[PDB]
Design a protein that fits this description.
The structure is a monomer. This protein has about 110 residues and is low in regular secondary structure. The protein has one domain: RNA polymerase II/Efflux pump adaptor protein, barrel-sandwich hybrid domain (OB fold (Dihydrolipoamide Acetyltransferase, E2P), Beta Barrel), CATH 2.40.50. The protein contains no helices and four strands. The strands form two sheets. It has a two-stranded antiparallel ribbon with strand order 1-2. It is elongated and about 65 Å long. It is found in: Mitochondrion matrix. It comes from Homo sapiens. Belongs to the 2-oxoacid dehydrogenase family. This is Dihydrolipoyllysine-residue acetyltransferase component of pyruvate dehydrogenase complex, mitochondrial.
Length: about 110
């Protein structure tokens, strides 16, 4: 009985759609490179003077494409700064493959 639906993809842009303004810049959300949260991580706290967006990373925030740290001014919405996902990380060349797939042929 897990609970999953559609793949994750935190658009670098701030998901506001109603910042009450048209010129907001990331205020504070310096995540830690390759972070990883599963109980509510930080969130791009954007602000302008009468509103502030927030990239609430509900249980997530592995810092995948975090390139624009708080301070970049693009807008109170589209302002794309980083793509969150909470990746688990996993590297390993492994050019050989003794086995084939995960289908254990009876």
């Amino acid at each position: 009985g897990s609970n999953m639906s559609y793949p994750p993809h935190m658009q670098v842009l701030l998901p506001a759609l109603s910042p009450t303004m048209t010129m907001g810049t990331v205020q504070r959300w310096e995540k830690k490179v390759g972070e990883k949260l599963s109980e509510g991580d930080l969130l791009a706290e954007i602000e302008t003077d009468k509103a502030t967006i927030g990239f609430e990373v509900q249980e997530e925030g592995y810092l995948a494409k975090i390139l624009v740290p708080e301070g970049t001014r693009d807008v109170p919405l589209g302002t794309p700064l980083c793509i969150i996902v909470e990746k688990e990380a996993d590297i390993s060349a492994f050019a050989d493959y003794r086995p084939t797939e995960v289908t254990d042929l009876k």
